[PDB]
Amino acid sequence: AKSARASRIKENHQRFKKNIAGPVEAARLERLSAKLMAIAQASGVKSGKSIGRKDSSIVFPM
Amino acid sequence: GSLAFLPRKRAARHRGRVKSFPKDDPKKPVHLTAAMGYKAGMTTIVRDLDRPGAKAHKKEVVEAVTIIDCPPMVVVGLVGYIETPRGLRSLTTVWAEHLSDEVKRRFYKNWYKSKKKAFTKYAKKYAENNGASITRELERIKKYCTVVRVLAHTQIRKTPLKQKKAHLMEIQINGGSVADKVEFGRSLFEKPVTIDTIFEKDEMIDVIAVTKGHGFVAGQMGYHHRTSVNHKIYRIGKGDDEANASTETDLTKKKITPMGGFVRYGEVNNDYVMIKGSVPGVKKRIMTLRKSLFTHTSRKALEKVELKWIDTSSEFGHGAFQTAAEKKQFMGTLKKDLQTS
Amino acid sequence: MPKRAVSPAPSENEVDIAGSLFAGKTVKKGGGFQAMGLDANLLRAIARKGFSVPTPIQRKTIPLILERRDVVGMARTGSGKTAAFVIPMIERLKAHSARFGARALVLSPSRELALQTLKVVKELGKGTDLKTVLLVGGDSLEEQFGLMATNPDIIIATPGRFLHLKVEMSLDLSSIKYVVFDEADRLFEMGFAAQLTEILHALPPSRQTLLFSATLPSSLVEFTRAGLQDPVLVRLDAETKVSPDLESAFFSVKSGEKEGALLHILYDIIKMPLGDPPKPTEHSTIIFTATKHHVEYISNLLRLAGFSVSYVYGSLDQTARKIQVDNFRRGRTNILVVTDVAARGIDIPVLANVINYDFPPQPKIFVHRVGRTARAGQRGWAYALVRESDLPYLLDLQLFLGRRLVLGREEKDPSFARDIVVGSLKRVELENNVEWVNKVLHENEDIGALKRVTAKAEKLYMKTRNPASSQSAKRAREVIVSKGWGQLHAIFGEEAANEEQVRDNLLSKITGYKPQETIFEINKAAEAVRSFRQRIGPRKSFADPEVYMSYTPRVKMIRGESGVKIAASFKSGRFEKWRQQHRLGRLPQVGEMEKANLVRNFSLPSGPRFKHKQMKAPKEADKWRDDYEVRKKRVAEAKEKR
Amino acid sequence: KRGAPGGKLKMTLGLPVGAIMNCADNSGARNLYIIAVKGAGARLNRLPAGGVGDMVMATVKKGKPELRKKVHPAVIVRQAKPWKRFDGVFLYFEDNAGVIVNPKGEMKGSAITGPVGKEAAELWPRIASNAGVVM
Amino acid sequence: TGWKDIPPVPTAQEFIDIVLSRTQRRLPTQIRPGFKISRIRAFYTRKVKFTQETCSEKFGAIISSFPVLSDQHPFHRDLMNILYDADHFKVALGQISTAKNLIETISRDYVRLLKYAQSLYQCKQLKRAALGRMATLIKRLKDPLIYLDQVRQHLARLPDINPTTRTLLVAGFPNVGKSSFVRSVTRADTPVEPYAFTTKSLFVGHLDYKYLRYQVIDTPGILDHPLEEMNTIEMQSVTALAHLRAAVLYFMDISEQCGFSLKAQINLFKSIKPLFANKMVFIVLNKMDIKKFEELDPEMQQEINDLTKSGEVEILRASCATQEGVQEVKNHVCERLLVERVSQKLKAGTHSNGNIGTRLQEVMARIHVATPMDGTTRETFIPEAVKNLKKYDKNDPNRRVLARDIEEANGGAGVFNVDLRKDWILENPEWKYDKIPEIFDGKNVYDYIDPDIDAKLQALEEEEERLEKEGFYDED
RNA sequence: GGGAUAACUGGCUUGUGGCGGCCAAGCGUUCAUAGCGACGUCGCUUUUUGGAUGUCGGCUCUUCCUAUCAUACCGAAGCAGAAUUCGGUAAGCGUUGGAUUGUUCACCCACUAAUAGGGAACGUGGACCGUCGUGAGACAGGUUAGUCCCUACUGAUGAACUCGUCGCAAUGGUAAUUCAGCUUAGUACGAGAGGAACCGCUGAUUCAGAUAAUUGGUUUUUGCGGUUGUCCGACCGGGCAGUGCCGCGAAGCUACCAUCUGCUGGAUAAUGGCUGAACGCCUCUAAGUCAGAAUCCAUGCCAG
RNA sequence: GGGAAGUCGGCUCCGUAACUUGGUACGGACAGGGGAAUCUG
Ligand SMILES: Nc1nc2c(ncn2[C@@H]2O[C@H](COP(=O)(O)OP(=O)(O)OP(=O)(O)O)[C@@H](O)[C@H]2O)c(=O)[nH]1
């Protein structure tokens, strides 16, 4: 028989993933993302916009 | 045995790790990937099979399914990861106000003795006009991080175990710019997300758990970390329907949980995911449900599933009654109910 | 799995007559039993049976047996050999012996033929007080211990069980004075040779041994040469004389037309009727073959042909053999298909025609086959399908019978009964009935599966057949070259010979053509074809009759009942268990008196030995069952009966 | 073609090798004795077994003497060990039975007594045509 | 059946490499002199013995596979004598049989030599002698191996002729009509180019006639030589004419368009007619389109009619070009041979005994048609719409679309989902594709369905009202 | 009776015989003739009609080699199709019996995809002497010869680095196999008999990992019911038959006796090419370079 | 106890009548039992 890691079996699987199971997972994922959206929508050093420091084994200790 | 699973090693942690989340591209929209639940038991179904080419085409087939009780999660944090030449690493983590008592219990081991002091100074950081630090925390995520995850925890107050601790994990957000998934995760803060939004009916998922341990009759037999792939979801229940187990060709108003309750679990009064076949783990155990890493190459996926009936009869013995009303009507009226009335 | 799992059951019939290398107030030679002087009780018991005249195999033997000479006996079945060896016991014995120990040992190969000698003994031994026990397989090995304690004087036994008794009992075997090995060629065929050797060593040196048989295989010859002392060969009269009333005909057929050739002989040569016939029948043709797989083809093809045919082979069932040899004997069927071993077992009546589907390897086997027919003055026929590979066995048949061989139409009127006449069949009607064979072969799968089995069965038989002599092999090449091999046979008439002659005189020039150029000449291969033809092209009473010295004349391992290879001398422990199961004392030695106790402790039953003895109590009564009260006392009655 | 039945869903095999099974057709045989279950896997110490619908090699041990001590292929039509069906019926028969059949799938018998398993009738159409009760 | 299943036979060199590489690759090759001499001897004996068995199983394969001449039909052993010299054929197979007998003799002698050997050098030299001696025996056998390879290719590339069946045989002089007639009646690859012998071998085709299979054999052609001498091409023709039972068809060119004289064509018939005396013959005067039977002078008609004065020869006329006679020359010949064969078949069964066989009883039963005694016929309910219904033609452009064509548009055998409700008939279409209730409150819905349930339920309403007025549910 | 080697092999072994003749490049005593001498060819074995095996085993299991039986891929063959045959890359994955035998192989028969061969210091579970004999022989004649430690690894723990939560992943192991049915299709191909394959679809064997709804099995829940025999003078209630016997049974554990699951990218080998020098033709190779095996390396998986 | 294995397994005497102490004809008996079950009224 042909192996599960055969190149021909992989190419047949790649055509299934692109043409048959492709848009079906895309349409389902669109509906799930719309549901997560409904749940979700239901100075720089003083405002925090500019990123500063909070609160060494890469260089030798001088 | 198999050398891929040897030596026989106990799982380092009782929960279970996702290890590999699916590969992300920004073209799809934002969606979460993993979820928990707690296993309640198993039951039987009958499915009108819709498989072209099989002998069981267009005839009834009995099928063993599992029931995982999933109360809604609560998003409490957002961790962001940066891509280093030593692997991914967590750059910073942002939490939310008003962490519940159950998620605070996870940080403790003696809750009864310890005064409730975890995240007390962090909550003041939100509210005492140091929200610049929280916005600096989120802006650092938006600028440097390549993937973000959601710290989400389940509520075992509604799940009927004796455990008051909660269970945390990281749930990866995929599908968008790193800026877009930040506003996604920040908006989810202090909010309950449901399993109806995480997965949907007729999709094939992976289950991560620790197996049953065979202690007390050459080494460790059982309690192994297993992830098992390609399990088909047959039904997402909503809990408040009062007809969770009712199908289109069985108009009986009944819930999923059997008569007398699930053995050593109780009644499933929340959202439940009904999955094909067996699942690693035991009753009352935490079950991590995860999306498929790769696009499916099977016709078992893309297969719509319709159900004829769900077995609501008792698993504490041989029972052939689905409801209490059916048992009473068949057995007639008895002398204890005659004396009570 | 069993496609020749062990071996073909009909193996071969080794035969030998090199067993000649063993050696007015006055009733004048009446040839009756009274002329031999038997017992007065015994001679009326013969008259009870109905043996008015002794059969010739008796008439030779029972003289010599009383004079106490060891007799090896050639005798076909149905000749009354069975009576021929027991009437010297009822003469020798005349009374039951008070001393312990049987004095007659009868060795039988099979269980059923043991009962045949059993039924003879009481039928010929009424009036006297002799004791007979049978020791066969399948009977209990606790009953057979007790029947020894009943102290017989004739023990009839299969050698597998008798040795198993002997090693278990440690019986002093010396009390027996006369041993008979009936059907010893059957004995060696089933694999009793090693157990016969251990029995023979344990038999006393003072004994009278005979051995009655249908044939003498070469392995049997060495057994008597080491076993019997001063043996004398007794043969049934003119067994080796082919009866001069028999007309023989041998037909040259190819291997692919052998089935259609058998259909020619039945249809147009014998003119056998179709269907069941409305004491044998008038046509009554036997068919001889080689293997049981050839039996199944030949039988099942003739059912599809429509002829009434019965069949017997080697490993055929006990009941299945009786019904088919019954059907042939009473004339309900026309064809009997035997290999050779089924032939020599079953009793053959007066027979009219004999067909040899496969030519016998030894020329003496052919004699045995034609000895079954054309006897007692009635005319007979015997046809055989000879082949090219079976040709040297035919020229060896010439040298044994000493007859002249004719090839097709070398003589105008060949003598069928005296000269060997070979030839070919009718061409036209052979191609019709081989068309039918190929049509049936392509049509039905079951006959086609029987062809493939008998094809590979034949291929084994070809390899293990005893090869012909070199002079017969060389002289076969010449008659193949000779022009008479393919000519029409002499039976079909002189009128058939003319239009065959006017055609084949021209046709034979087509067959004798030599191509001057093979088609590959018509390259390196073309130079190769030229290379062979250059290399392999064709290459350019004075003696007195009185004295002329002519170069021509004139731990031992056995097989147990379990089928596992057991060491020969194994004392299992059953007699030891037997000897405290009833707590018997020491057994008698040879010579001491019987105990009137020991005979009545282990006597015989009333006589009908049913095979069913399972006594069980019924199951316990269930108080919710339908037949509760009926079950209740029958369980209690079982406790009362116990 | 090798005699391997195609497109059947496997059940609990309840007739191992060296098992005496009844004979259902009117061929004269009253008993069959399994020596080979073809299509079985090659495993050490694992006795080959077959269920209802599997075609096996058998030897006649009881019956008419013309058909005694012969080897024919046969199809198992009833078995006593319980087995699954795809609709959820756990079920079993009263005896173990089979019908003498040719390698193509045509039975030598003319009629079948007793019931016939549903799997054997689906796999072999000639047994289905000669069946009286398909249960 | 055929001789295609003869295994390919290698040359002497390819025999040597196959045998010697089999010995090296499929057995161990490592032995050291420090080992025991018993296992050194056991190593080298196994190598010599293994080489012989592969030689014997290969020399036995060629002997067994090739057909033995004295087991075939007289057609086949004569055809295989002409095609390959049968004198040359059994000495090629005979040489390979005595070559295998010598190889075992080499192997039997050298295992005895090895058993008494005393060093690893001695065992090494003894094996090389044995493997070398078998090598030089095969290398001498080079010449017959090429012959047996070439006769194997041509045997597998030979038409299947079965002498038993009904056969139409087409013979005659060269360049008359043979290849055109066989092509016209039977689809069979037979060349048609116009020169002396285009066909050099027998060509076989098959035809049907009243649902019975007939085979037709085309042959090269025969010249006027008196069969003492002919080449291998025309000796193939007369072998099929002499050994195969057939209603032969002697094609004769009335015109001289073959370039060969018409009087010579009659002289071939009178020479080969003794091989035709038993069978039935038909002479086809082919090519009347260019020369008709009335155009030649009356002298040749008389001797043509004299051929008909022999009772087994018929005059039939046909012309392959324009097919002016081929169908009725086909229908005539197979009809006459069919009624001949049925005459022999009724004789074979009505032979002078008085008893009919069981095969005759089975076949008269098939021909007998049972008819009811009263002779009435039952009424047939064939619908009126099916008589004018148009037959389905797959090449017709305007086709009714089948379920196969619906399947291929919507997938394949394992993709298409059949809709078993689209063929449902109901009162109104939207009731279809509906989920049908099955269980309700622990009972089967189906057992509770009947028409007039509404009126039956009113009896439940009225009788309940009766028992409520009767007070039969009162507590005391 | 005296003398002599302490003992064998350790770049050993495998596929192509020996003898004599002819031919023969070179080298040489001074030159192809003092002579050594391969590849071939000739003569012998060897030609014109088609059984062999002594002590051993037998089974499981681990690991390795390839000198490959099957399964994947290619090159060639009158290879039409089907089935094959020879060769090459390949050790990923699998690898039987029966008859017969002292035992094996050969052969034969059956099954299977096939039921290859080997390695693992050839893996882990007598020895004289004495006595009597001497044409040969012995001895109820003798005495004597002659082997419980340390540690690697695995699992479960574990001191210290403040406790706890969520993670990353260096490194190590790594997993899936084989067959069938439907469609293609009675189609290509074929004179006939026969008769494929790709894509798609559905099962099954082996192997691995799980699980207990349902169906069997099991009953320190000693749960319910029936029953045998004993004693306490009798009832009650007990000792009793180291858990009496008989039915049914929950829970739990189980079952190749039940059910579920087993996933994808890149680089290659044999080989097939593209452009194109060497070499004014030509060439798949030299510089560049496309495809391609169950192979390699990783992901998926396990440990951390 | 069961399954497996191997087999070839399961499918004449009493009384009565004439004849020479022994034979001959007639009448009667032998050449079954147990266990498990189903369907039917
Ligand atoms: N006019 C005419 N010519 C014919 C006819 N039949 C055959 N031919 C000629 O014959 C040629 C066909 O080959 P045939 O002669 O039939 O074949 P053949 O008889 O086996 O002889 P070969 O030519 O060797 O094959 C054609 O080229 C025609 O020219 C016919 O009926 N009418």
Side-chain angles (χ1 to χ4, degrees), chain B residues 69-115:
Chain B
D69 172 30
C70 327
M73 289 175 137
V74 152
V75 165
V76 287
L78 171 129
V79 63
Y81 283 61
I82 64 131
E83 190 197 313
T84 74
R86 289 177 296 166
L88 256 52
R89 73 158 198 124
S90 59
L91 180 63
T92 206
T93 320
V94 199
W95 290 97
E97 281 146 310
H98 311 290
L99 285 142
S100 170
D101 263 41
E102 30 196 7
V103 64
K104 278 156 158 309
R105 272 171 173 262
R106 170 60 47 173
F107 302 106
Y108 286 100
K109 259 161 170 59
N110 296 358
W111 182 257
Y112 73 110
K113 263 195 312 216
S114 80
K115 40 198 62 53

Side-chain angles (χ1 to χ4, degrees), chain E residues 4 25 29 44 46 63 87 98 133 187 206 213:
Chain E
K4 270 266 296 281
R25 300 247 263 273
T29 48
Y44 282 97
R46 190 187 203 206
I63 288 166
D87 228 326
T98 177
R133 276 177 99 167
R187 74 161 191 91
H206 303 83
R213 185 80 97 206

Side-chain angles (χ1 to χ4, degrees), chain C residues 407-442:
Chain C
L407 265 287
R409 45 232 188 84
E410 281 179 2
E411 190 186 351
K412 282 188 181 180
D413 276 331
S415 96
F416 281 173
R418 184 161 41 280
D419 297 328
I420 295 150
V421 182
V422 81
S424 72
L425 291 141
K426 218 152 285 152
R427 167 173 142 272
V428 281
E429 169 38 6
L430 270 282
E431 311 179 349
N432 326 325
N433 55 19
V434 299
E435 178 199 8
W436 182 89
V437 162
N438 304 337
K439 188 180 178 183
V440 168
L441 255 285
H442 215 294

Side-chain angles (χ1 to χ4, degrees), chain D residues 19-102:
Chain D
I20 274 301
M21 81 206 210
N22 212 84
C23 204
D25 58 336
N26 54 356
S27 56
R30 300 263 274 100
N31 198 338
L32 304 166
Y33 167 78
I34 286 162
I35 327 163
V37 187
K38 74 198 39 51
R43 191 195 288 176
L44 187 70
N45 300 341
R46 177 179 183 86
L47 276 205
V52 174
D54 283 345
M55 188 203 57
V56 286
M57 312 284 327
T59 305
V60 177
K61 284 213 190 184
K62 274 202 201 273
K64 136 180 103 186
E66 297 289 325
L67 258 302
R68 203 176 284 129
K69 230 281 194 201
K70 333 276 217 292
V71 168
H72 305 260
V75 164
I76 306 171
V77 85
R78 303 199 281 278
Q79 99 175 349
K81 198 169 180 0
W83 75 89
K84 263 276 298 303
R85 278 183 182 176
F86 62 96
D87 44 348
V89 194
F90 260 96
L91 79 183
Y92 64 110
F93 279 105
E94 208 180 356
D95 65 308
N96 306 270
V99 279
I100 289 171
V101 73
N102 84 326

